[PDB]
Symmetry: T
Subunit: 161 residues, 12 copies
C-alpha cells in the first residue's frame, strides 16, 4: 500500500455554474440544428434533391451525437442539461427555419447559416470552457471540426466559379 490513498470518499470534478451554462448554450443550438436539419431533409425540393436529402441526414446524425456528447459531459461533471422543446425554442440562437417546401438552393444557404450559428456558439464559449476544463474543450474541437466540414460540404453546392 506504499503509495495508496486512504480516503474513503474521493469526489469527482464538479463544473461551475458558468461552465454548466456554457455547455447548455451549445446543447440547445445542437438540438435546434438537428430539428432544423430534419425539417430541411423532409421539405427540400428541386435540382440535386437526393444529395441534399442525404447530406442533411448526415448533418442531423452528427448534431444528434454532438448533443448527446455535450449533455452526457454535463452529467459527468455534475451539471444538468435541458433539451426540452420549450427550452430549445426559447433559448436557441439559430434563426428560425422557414415553413413549407424549399428549393435546394434556398436550403443550402439556410442550413449553411444555421450550421455557422451553431459553430459560432461553440467558438464563443470555447475559451471559458478550455480555461476550466481542457478535456471538454477537446469535445468542442470535435464539434467545430465536424460541423465546419458539414458547412463546406453543403455550401459548395451553391458556389459559382
Amino acid at each position: 500500500m506504499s503509495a495508496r490513498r486512504t480516503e474513503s470518499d474521493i469526489q469527482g470534478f464538479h463544473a461551475t455554474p458558468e461552465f454548466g451554462g456554457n455547455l447548455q448554450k451549445v446543447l440547445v443550438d445542437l438540438i435546434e440544428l438537428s430539428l432544423q436539419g430534419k425539417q430541411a431533409h423532409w421539405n427540400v425540393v428541386g435540382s440535386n434533391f437526393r444529395d441534399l436529402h442525404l447530406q442533411l441526414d448526415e448533418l442531423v446524425d452528427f448534431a444528434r451525437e454532438g448533443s448527446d456528447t455535450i449533455a452526457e459531459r454535463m452529467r459527468a461533471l455534475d451539471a444538468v442539461p435541458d433539451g426540452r422543446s420549450d427550452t430549445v425554442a426559447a433559448t436557441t440562437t439559430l434563426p428560425e427555419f422557414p415553413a413549407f417546401e424549399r428549393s435546394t438552393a434556398d436550403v443550402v444557404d439556410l442550413i449553411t447559416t444555421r450550421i455557422n450559428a451553431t459553430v459560432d456558439t461553440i467558438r464563443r464559449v470555447h475559451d471559458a470552457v478550455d480555461a476550466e476544463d481542457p478535456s471538454t474543450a477537446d469535445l468542442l474541437h470535435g464539434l467545430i471540426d465536424g460541423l465546419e466540414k458539414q458547412a463546406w460540404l453543403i455550401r459548395s453546392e451553391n458556389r459559382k466559379v
Copy 2:
C-alpha cells in the same frame, strides 16, 4: 398490349384533414423523442443503467417513427412541420420536468407520455385508415412498437 396511354399519371394526394392528422402524430413523436433524451440524461437512482439504456431504445424508435410519418406526408403531397416552436406549441404530451429525476419517477413519467403518444395515434387511426389503409399500417407499427416500450418501461414499477 394492355399499356396505358397516359403521359402524366398523378400520385395519391392526401386531403388537408389527412395531412393534419399525420402532423398531429408527428409532433407527439418528436416531443416523445426529446422527452426521452431528457429522461435518458437526467435519470438517477436504483437500476439507473437499465433505464438509461431502455430510454435510448425508445428514442431510436420515436425518431425513426417521426421520419416514417414525415416522409409518408411528403409521399402523399403533405408538408410536415417538425420545428421546435411548432412541436412546443402543438404537442399534446404533458410537459416532462427539468432536473434530475429518480428511476421510479422516470418510469411513471415516460409511461404516461408514451401512452399520450399512443393515444394520438389511436385517435386519428380510423380517419387515416378510411382514406389510406397503407398509412394506417404504418400507424399499427407505431402503436405496436410504443406499446411494447410502455410495457418494458412500466414493468420496473409493478408491485408483485
Copy 3:
C-alpha cells in the same frame, strides 16, 4: 399557446379477457408448432433429408419469433400468456406429431398439416382480434404470411407435375 394535456396519469390500452384468450390460442399453437418442427427436424430420414432438415429449422425459427411476438403483445396489452409445457399439451389444437423416425415424404405431409392447423387458428381468431385492435391483427397477418410461405416451401417436395 399550448395543446399540452394535463393528466398526471394516462393509462394504456387494456385487452378484454376474450381478446387475451384469442391471443393465448394463437400462442399455444405456435409453441406446439415449434416443438413439433424440432421433433421432425431431428427425426426425418430418407430421400432429400438435408433440405427438409434445414427448412424445418427455418420454420422453427419463425414459429419461435412468432410465439415471442404474440406473448409480448399480450404483455403490452395487460394480458398474461401461458406457454408452459402442460398448458401447451392440454390446449393445443394441432394433431400430435408421431413418435420415432419418419420418412421425408411423411414429414412433408405431417408438418404441412400442422402448419395449416396453426394458420387456421390465426384465421379463426383474426376478425375478433381485428375488431378490438387492428395493430395486433397486423401481427397476425405477418404470422399468416410467414407460415403459409413455410407450408409452400415444405409441401412442394410432395407435389407431383
Copy 4:
C-alpha cells in the same frame, strides 16, 4: 384434448380471381424493374449520379416486391407468370422510350411508371383485402415503398 383429429387439414385456398389480381400486380412490378434498369443505364445529364443510384434502389424494391407477390401467389396455390412475352403483352405501364434520356425526362418518365404501378395495386386492393387481409398488408408495403420512390425521384424536377 383440444387436439384436432383429422389427418390432413387443408390450408387456405385463394379463388382464381384473387390469383389474377395478384398476377396484375406482378406484371407491372416486373415491367417497372425492367424500365428502371433501362433508365438506370441510359440516363445522362445534370445530377446523373443521384438518378443512376436512385433508379437502382427503385429496381431493388420492385424486384423484391415481385418476388413477394409471386411467392404469396405460390403460398395460396396460385401460379405466377413473369415471362417476358406475358409481361410485355399484359403490363399496364406506358412503354419506356429507347435511347439516352436526360435526367429531367427520366424523372418525369419514371414517376409516371411508378404511379401506374401503384394505381394497379390500389385498383385491386379492396378485392384482395375482402378475400385475404394478410395479402392486403403486402400490398400496403408496396404502395408505401413505391410512393416513397415516386416522391424521392419527382422532387428533383419540383420548382418552388
Copy 5:
C-alpha cells in the same frame, strides 16, 4: 497398404440405456427453455429489464443445448422425443407457476429450475462418460454453461 479392405465399416453404436440417459437430459433442457420464456414474458418489478434480458440468454443456451443433445443422440442412432406431452410427462423440473411474478420470485424460481436441470446432467454423467467420453464433454459444456446462468441470476437476490 495400410488401407482397410472392408466395404462398409459400421460407426460407433450407443446402447439404448445411453440413449435414454441423453433423453433425460433433453426433456429437462426443453422444459427449462419453456419455463425460461414463461418467466421472460411474465416477470415484473424492480430490475425488470436485466431479468427479462438474462432469461432470454438462458433460453438461448437451453435451446442450443437441447439441439446439441438431440443431434448427438441422432449421430449415435438414438431417437429423441421433444414433444410437448413427453416433456410435460417426463421432465423432473418443478412446474413454473402461472401469472405475473416479481423479479425476486423469478430469481429464486429459475435458479431452482437451472439447478434441477444441472442435477439431471450430473446424475447421468458417469454412465454417459463410461460409454462415450466425447458425449460427456458435451455434458461438461452444459454443466458449465448452466451453472454460470445460475450464478448470474441468483446473484440478484444475494444479500451481503
Copy 6:
C-alpha cells in the same frame, strides 16, 4: 523535364455499331435467362424442390449481375443498351419457358437448355468482341465460366450413374 500530353480534350474508346449489336445480343439473352430463371424458381414442384428453388435464385443473381455488367460496358463504350420487355421478347434466342407448374426433373432439363443457349450466344459473338476489344472479351469469359458452372450445378440432378 516532362512527358505530359497537351490536348485539352482526349476522347475515349468508341465501339463500332457491330460491336454494340453483339453486346446487345448478349444482353437480351441474359435478361431473358433472369426472367425464365425466376419463373422456374417460383413454379418448380416435386422431389428435391428446395435445392432447385435455391439454385435457380443463384442463377438469377448471376444473370442479373451479368446483364448490368454488359449494359454498363456498352455505356462505357458509347453504345446504347435496350433491355425493355418488348425488345427482350422479340429478340431473345432462348426457347420460351413453358407456362404453369413444372416438375423438378423438367425444370432441370429446361433451365440447362436455356443456360446452354445463353452461353452459345456469348461464345458466338466472342471472337468478334475479342478482336475489337480484349477487355470486354474478359467480361464475356466471366459470364461463360459463371453460367457453365450454373449449368453443371443444375443439370447434375438429372445425370444418372
Copy 7:
C-alpha cells in the same frame, strides 16, 4: 512475501514417441478424409446432387480444421507431423475412394464408411492419448463429435422409413 519460482529455464510437456505416432495416425486419416471428401464433392451426380455437394464441403471444412488442430497439437508437444501426399497414401487406413463419377446413393454410402473409418482411428488411439495427456483427448472428443454429426447428416439420405 513471494511464491515466485526461480528457474531461468522451464521446459514444456514433451510427448512420447508413441503419443506422437498416435496423433500422426489421426492426422493422415483426417487428411485422407479431406481429399476423398473433395473428390466426392466434385464427382457426385444424381438425385439430390446439390445437398450432397454442399454437405461434402462442410465435411471437408471440418476435416481440414481437424488436421490443422492435430498437427499443431503435435507441434505444441514437440512432435513432428507428416501430412505429405506419399505418406498419407502409404499410411491411411481409409478404403480408397473410387475413380470417376459416382451416384448420390453411392457417395452417401462410400463417404459414411470413410467417416466411420476416420472416427474408428480416433476411438482406437483415444485411451492411450487420454492416459498421457487429457487435454489432447478433449481435441479428439471434438473430432469424434463433429465427424459423427457429419456421418448422420450424410447417411440419413439413404436411410429408409
Copy 8:
C-alpha cells in the same frame, strides 16, 4: 529536391525523465483500476447485479485500452513503461479494493472512488504533460472524458433524489 532536407538521420521527439515519470504514474493507476474493476466484476452481488457486472467490464475495457495507449505513447517518445504486478501494487495511488463478495451498493461507492482517484492522477500530471507535449495531453483528455463518463454511469445507481 528544392525544399528537401539532406540529413541522413533525423531523430524523433524524446520525452524528458519528468514526462516519462508522469506517464508512468497514469499507467499504474489505469492498470490498478483494470484489476480492481475485474475484482468488482467477479465478486459483486445483490440488487441490480447484472447492470453492475456489465458496466464494470466496460470500465475494464476502457482502462485496459487506456493503459495500452499510455504505455505505447511512452514507447513512441523513447520512454519505458513498467506495468508489472509488483510495480503496480507498490506505486498505485488507488485505495485497495476489499476482498470477498461485496453488495452492489458498496461496489458503486468503492469503484466511483477508485475511478476518481485515477482521474485525479491524470488531472494532476496534465499541465506538466501539456507544457512538454500537447499531443499527449490530448490522449489524457480522452482518458479524463471516458473515465468521468464511467464514474457518472456507475455512481448514478446510488443517487437518491
Copy 9:
C-alpha cells in the same frame, strides 16, 4: 512418380521492355490518383456532393490499380518507381489545374485525364499480352474499371 528433380526452379523474368511498359502504366495511375484527390478536394458548384464522392471512388480504383501493377512488376523481377519526382517527370497526363474548379470543368478535366490513363494502358496492351497474357488480364481490369469511371463522370455533362 512424375516428380521434377530440380532443386532451384526460377520464376518468369520480365524483359526490360516489359518492365518499362508496366512502369509507364504505373506513373499514369499514380498521377491519376493524385489528380483525382486534387479534384475531390477542390470541386465546387452544382452537384458538388455526387462529384466529390465519385472522384473518391476513382481514386480508390486508381490506387488499387497502381498497387496491382507495381506488385506484378515485383512478381516478375521488375522494379517499380512511384516516387513524386519520377511521377511528375514521366507521367503522360495533362496537368490538373490548381485552385477551386466548377463541377462542369472538373467533369471535363477528369474525363480527359482518365482517357489519357486508359490510352497508356491500351498503347502497351499488345506488347504486354505478347509476352505475358496473365498481366494483360490485369490490364483489362484496369481498362474496364477506368472506362466505367469515365462514363459515370462524363454523363454529368451530357446534353440530352
Copy 10:
C-alpha cells in the same frame, strides 16, 4: 408426472481445496497477462512486429482464461482474488524483467513463464478433475491454448 417436489434445490458447492486450486490457476493467468503486456510494450530488435503482435494474442488468451476461471469459481460458490498485491505475493511465475528487452530474450523469457503457467494448471488438474470433470475441461482449453502460444513464440529461437 416425474416432476421434482423441491422448492429450493442448491447448486454444486466447491470444497475449499478446489477453490484454492482454481485461485492458484487464476493468479498465474493474471500474472502472465501482465507480463505479456510488459513484453508487448518493451520488446525491440529483429522481428519486433511479429513478437509485438503474438504477445498481444497471448495476453488476450490469458485474460479470457482468467475471466473463465474466476467466473467458474463464482458459479461453484468460491471467491476469486485477482488484486495486484495478491497476484504479486502468490504468483509462481518467475518475475519478468523491467526495461527494453531483445526479441531473442523476450522469446526465451515468455516461453518460460507460459510453461510455468501451464505447469500450475497441470499440477492442479487431477484434483480438479476428481471433484468436477466439467472444470477440468476448462483447464484443458487453457493447457491447449497456452501450449500453442509457447510453440508459436519459442519457434522463433529454434536453430535448424
Copy 11:
C-alpha cells in the same frame, strides 16, 4: 421470333486432352497445398510467425485454385482426380522433405514448389487457350496469384 426451336441445346464440350491438361494443373495445386501445410506446421527459426502465416495464405490460394480447376473440369464434363494416390503418383513437384526445417530453407523450398506449379500452368496454357479462352482466364488468375506468393515468400531470403 428470334427464339430457337430445338428442345435440348447441348453445352460446350471440352476434348479429353483439354480435360487432361486441367488434370495436370489440379494435381500440382493439390500437391502444393499439402506441401504448404507441411511447411506451415514444421517451419522453425527466425521470422517463424510471418512464414507460418504466409504459408497458410498460400495454402488458402492453392485450395481455392484447385476447387476452381476441378469445378471448371466438371462444368465442361471432364472428371477430376484429386485422390492422394493419384496426386502422389502424378504431381511434377519435387517432394517436400520430412522433419523441422529452418525458415531460410522453407523460403527456398516453397519458392521452388510454387515455381514448379506455375510452370505446369504456363506449359498447358496455349493448348487450353486455343480450345477455351474462358478457361485460360482462370489460368491467368492462378499464374498471377501464385507468382505473387512466390515474390512475397522469396523476398525473405533476398540479400541486397
Copy 12:
C-alpha cells in the same frame, strides 16, 4: 424567437493566408510520405520482409487519411490545398527515397527518418496553428500521435539491446 439571431447570412471561420500556408506544408509532407511508403512497401527485400511490407502499408493508410483530413480542413476553413505531383516534389521537406530494391534494415532507417521529417513539419507549425484555431491543432495532435507510433513500430526492428 427570444434568443434567435435575425441575420440572413452568417459567415464561417476563414483561415488566414499564414494558416493556409502552414496546413499546405503539412499536406505535401503527408502526401510525399504516402508515396515513399508505397515505394518502400513494393521494393523492400530481405530478413523480416513480410512484417515490413505490411507495416509500411499501415503507415501509407494513416498518411493518406491524414492528407485527406488536412486538405478537407483547409476546404472547411476556405483555404485551397495543392496535392499535385509537381507541387509535392518541389515543396516537400522529406529527403528523397532512393531507387531500386532496398534491404529491410535500410528501409527501417530510411522510413523512420522520413516519418520524423513529417512529424517535425507538424511540430514546427503547431503553435501558429494552435494560436489561430485550437480545433485544427487537435487534428495535428492525431497526426503526431499516429505517426510517432508508426516510427516506434518501424524503428524497433533495427534496435540492438
